[PDB]
From TrEMBL, chain C:
The chain holds residues 174 to 259 of 776 of the full protein. It comes from the Eukaryota. In the C-terminal section; belongs to the gamma-glutamyl phosphate reductase family. It comes from Drosophila melanogaster. This is Delta-1-pyrroline-5-carboxylate synthase.
């Protein structure tokens, strides 16, 4: 079986389609699946005019024949009686079906040739070889030999069209093999069972038996879904459809998906009972080991970035690939601060209240569970997020990028060691090297939270891709600035300086500007535009300014665009309320800032604006959590739930209600029992 | 235009398909869209063998003709030169295409008849009438007259195949009209613009001009997507595809969708500045008005439930339709408690911390925004959830069921009045009466949170349906009970009593049981089974018990089933840890309870179990929030984020970071400026 | 094929099949499976004779090249 991977399909030369009887007929048994049939034939004529070697093996003649025979038998009775067989249908259907195929194909210039066979024809070797050389000749002549079994005179380990197709594919020595059947694939139990798990690849029934048999002779077998649209062009498209069949890539190559997740769940439950300074000691040891074997990891990083450099794929990426013992020291000290602050994050009380005699309760913090972080290779965060997990005592699934994968593996074994030290388990599992983002993205019930961290491309591709799963992270940092008629100019000057000039590539970086039109005449417009020129900032403009000015800067494509570089649209309005309108109209509710000296307008703004965060005489670059004294954050959430913007450690917990009644019961508290409600909010511990 | 609604399509008799040239050819311009063509023809033969009156109007002859002509022109040159027109292609394609259609149709018994026309043929009235009677005759004879324009000798408000189709449909006086075109529908601007809004129904360009023209003569026009699979059988299926065209159902009938949402957003922002006892006074007035006009609402409820009773659709539903001044008093007093407790839920500080000189911040509570509650008609919650909203000061979208819709309208006008009293706006909007759950379910960026409250059918249908939107509510209440070898029996007896017997129909009701096998020999098994018989409880069993006992109760279908009635699987294991395993294996992490007298095992359980809530010597029916002294809850969340189980008012807020710096800036705090981090946690206000 | 006449069961299946077809007002255009198994049946002619016998038909027409016999 030369081919082994669903990219290698691009290069199959000789392939053998095989349609099932379910494909041809409908459920009404009143015709054909003409749409499906002609679709298959169009795909085959395409993939053959390409140059490939293709030879269908049909089926379902008897169904068509039965339709025809029934109609005739109706049409041949006495009108009196109207007022109250394998071989026959076989032959009739064979004729009509060949005619139909022939018209359809000749619509594409190609030519066909019926070839009927029987079972004993395989037992005579000479017959077998005559058939073989015949088929090879036909194919060599650019012909599409539509094979079938001579059921018309001799109905039938060849016991079907399927085993037939297998034996053929072997003898013909073809590349591929497609059993376009009724069902869509394979599971470890019927759909009306437990374990509806698709066998997108198959390691190592009648269908499956033939699959085994043939696959043991050099062919590469597939099984698709007959009713699955654009089947063949997509299988050749390489995309994972149906149950591909190849040999094993066992855990020596990769644990498939889940065992990692469940191992992580288990170890999370383990460390759940390992609170008091256990994980603190763990992160202490981890920072130590980070500063103790950096030479190894420095050299791994150096070599891996040097390897990636020959590709030269992305200057931002290749620059983030920088790693030096300065960053190592920064990571170590941040992790030390994590160890410090992470003392009593978990298992902490929130409420203390009694309802009845000896009937108290509380609502206690608790890890979230299985976390899947995803990020372009910025390996500096790997130990960061690992420390976050092991402080929060929740498991963590890891999947970065192919870049720096070796350095990532180094960091991974580092942290795995440091955790196995105390924790009794590597309650963490990395996986990389072609981890089919969409697939595990679709998998549910084990993962909890998607944490994209790489860059805006990642978060976008996720949001558009992610479906039915808690995600995090913003989509784009379309910040907004407003300056009031009650604001000194140089303030706004240095403010816009720190705003745009500081790091235009940031996510939380400003990309717009809004000014009270009243003060437009105060030369401040010119001041700021000239300052932007001092920084060489591309300036766009909007309808209000274009109306206002004569020559002016160029226009703007769309108010809801982001640049990431020295480009910032600028608009101007009269009304603070109008500012509210515009912001809410375009802004991502991500960030905002007010520069003014009156609080009345300022506080009205603040109370009215619905950003993720608002400010006063400050900088959008303040949005880093670490700047908030929040400790090591994990990301920036614009989602309307559970967390806003700076997401520290607490954004990685939930609560759990616990109660200890004596013998209490619900109906007991009703008037039928001497039980009351107290709701005395006991002072939390 | 007799037909007006996408259910009425079931009854079209005479319809006129019309394919566009994009449908027939591919992009390679190297053949036909044989799959698409045969699919269309299969659909037409189906919908015609049904009995309908159908007559296609094709196009794209010239493309096919161009393919043929090019091939010929190649095949007719000197081999030397190979080493370095409307009408022609028109006629050739016409011939070949008619042949193809004919073979395809004759595959289904029907018969066709080419009919070519020209433009001037419509200007001669006699010609027009001859054509008309001819067509009527053909149709009457069960023939499928594939019309087309005589472009072969005379190429061309008839200026296309489209206007042609319109004029025909008018003259023929047909029911429907389908312009299966390239694009999928209509928006108020091109897709590469702003306003990609589908025109699923159209109120009141060349295509659109013809649509207007024809629709003004009694026909019902549609526009589908040529490449859209199973087009016609689905349009006839009635389902909303493409831009249906009918007359207006203006706001006098219904505001479409969004204006409600935006009105609500606005009014929410209004009431956002109306905190101090304003909304408290509002709910006071609302409870008053609830107790002041109940006679009106009692009679509306009575009449509406009497109307629904003639249907007799669901005893649980019809029983929940009960409404009486006792429930009215209960609602009023609960709303009074809401008024009481809802004082300072919103706009409250959470943190108080300074980072640098005059650089402080805080993180303040804030409404969530647009809430969409969905529920089978249990109108008792309408004022409940309304009070929740108006206490939380967040807007609310309402959509219940068709049942009690009039009583719901009564409650709606009640609360709308009470809100307009003070609040300056009806910051709330109901919508019911066929509100296309899936549609607004798909709409984003305005709604925030889906709150299903009706019953488990609703929450299920939602979860399976809901996509990319914050939802709430559990899926099923698969609770679990464990009794330990260190637990007195009668305790567990009364516990299981209150557990199952109290209300087996509850969501938070137990449906399983687990017991330490050690104590199985203590007759407690018999005690509880006999007690269940005293309550007539259907008893199932599992593998461990089936092994253990000889005759025993019947088995269980699936451990992950729910009953809602007197049915409860029962299993038995030795290990508390095994209990953990089984629970985590099947449980919805929804609820659990431990009855025992030793805390060591108990506390190990508690710390280890990952339910949404856990207990000790208590009842699963305790899970109501109101029982928790939590005040009026809204639902029960099993989602792993932001809220667990009992979701009070606080589960309807978020936070917002605010800052007031003096002139501070990010780069200012770097070593290049004399700024430091303080992170002094000021005592919160 | 040729061997199909040597198996009696095959012969009788073929026979009842043909009778059924004819009874159904169908025109069974017979031929020999020369496509996989080229060949007193040694032609289409002896074939036609054996058939006409087995089918028990009235007439038999061998429309051949020449016009007759001398």
């Amino acid at each position: 079986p030369t081919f082994t991977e669903r990219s290698q399909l691009k290069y199959a030369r000789r392939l053998v389609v095989k349609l099932g009887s379910a494909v041809i007929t409908r459920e009404d048994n009143h015709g054909l699946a003409l749409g499906r049939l002609a679709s298959i034939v169009e795909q085959v004529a395409e993939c053959h005019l390409e140059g490939r070697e293709v030879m269908m093996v049909t089926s379902g003649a008897v169904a068509f024949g039965k339709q025809k025979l029934a109609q005739e038998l109706l049409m041949s009775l006495s009108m009196r009686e109207t007022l109250n067989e394998p071989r026959a249908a076989a032959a009739v259907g064979q004729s009509g079906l060949m005619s139909l195929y022939d018209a359809m194909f000749a619509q594409y210039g190609v030519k066909i040739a019926q070839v009927l066979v029987t079972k004993p024809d395989f037992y005579n070797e000479e017959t077998r070889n005559n058939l073989f050389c015949t088929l090879s000749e036909l194919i060599s002549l650019n012909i599409v030999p539509i094979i079938n079994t001579n059921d018309a005179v001799s109905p039938p380990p060849i016991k079907d069209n399927d085993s037939l197709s297998a034996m053929l594919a072997a003898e013909v020595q073809a590349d591929l093999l497609i059993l376009m059947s009724d069902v869509d694939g394979i599971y470890n139990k019927p759909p009306w069972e437990d374990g509806a798990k698709l066998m997108h690849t198959y390691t190592s029934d009648s269908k499956v038996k033939a699959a085994t048999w043939a696959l043991d002779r050099g062919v590469s077998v597939v099984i698709c879904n007959g009713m699955q649209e654009k089947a063949i062009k997509t299988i050749i498209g390489g995309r994972k459809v149906g149950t591909f069949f190849t040999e094993a890539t066992e855990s020596a190559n990769a644990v498939p998906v889940e065992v990692m997740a469940e191992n992580a769940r288990t170890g999370s439950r383990q460390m759940q009972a390992l609170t008091p300074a256990q994980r603190a000691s763990a992160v202490n040891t981890l920072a130590d080991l980070l500063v103790s074997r950096e030479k190894f990891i420095l050299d791994a990083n150096a070599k891996d970035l040097a390897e990636a450099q020959k590709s030269g794929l992305a200057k931002p990426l290749l620059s983030r690939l920088s790693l030096n013992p300065a960053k190592l020291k920064n990571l170590s000290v941040g992790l030390k601060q994590i160890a410090e602050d992470s003392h009593k994050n978990v298992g902490r009380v929130l409420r203390r209240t009694r309802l009845a005699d000896q009937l108290e309760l509380k609502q206690v913090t608790v890890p979230i569970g299985v976390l899947l972080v995803i990020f372009e290779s910025r390996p500096d965060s790997l130990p960061q997020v690992a420390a976050l997990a092991m402080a929060s005592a929740n498991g963590l699934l890891l999947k970065g990028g192919k870049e720096a994968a070796h350095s990532n593996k180094a960091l991974m074994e580092l942290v795995k060691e440091a955790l196995a030290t105390v924790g009794a388990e590597h309650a963490v599992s990395l996986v990389s090297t072609r981890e089919e983002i969409s697939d595990l993205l679709s998998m549910e019930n084990h993962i909890d939270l998607i944490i994209p961290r790489g860059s805006s491309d990642l978060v976008r591709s996720i949001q558009q891709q992610s479906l039915h799963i808690p995600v995090l992270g913003h989509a784009e940092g379309v910040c907004h600035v407003y300056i009031d008629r009650d604001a000194d100019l140089e303030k706004a000057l240095r403010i816009a300086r720190d705003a745009k000039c500081d790091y235009p590539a940031a996510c939380n970086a400003m990309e717009t500007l809004l000014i009270h039109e009243d003060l437009m005449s105060g030369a401040i417009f010119g001041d700021v535009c000239n300052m932007l020129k001092r920084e060489g900032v591309k300036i766009y403009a909007g309808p209000r300014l274009n109306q206002q000015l004569t020559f002016g800067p160029p226009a703007a494509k769309s108010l809801k665009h982001e640049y990431g570089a020295l480009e910032c649209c600028i608009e101007v309005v009269p009304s603070l309320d109008e500012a509210i309108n515009h912001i809410h109209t375009y802004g991502s509710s991500h960030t905002d800032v007010i520069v003014t000296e009156n609080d009345a307008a300022a506080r009205q703004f603040l109370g009215s604006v619905d950003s993720a965060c608002v400010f006063h005489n400050a900088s959008s670059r303040f949005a880093d959590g670490f700047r908030f004294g929040l400790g090591a954050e994990v990301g920036i959430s614009t989602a309307r739930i559970h967390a806003r913007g700076p997401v520290g450690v607490e954004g990685l917990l939930t609560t759990k209600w616990i109660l200890e009644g004596q013998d209490h019961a619900a109906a007991d508290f009703a008037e039928g029992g001497g039980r009351t409600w107290l709701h005395e909010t006991l002072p939390l511990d």
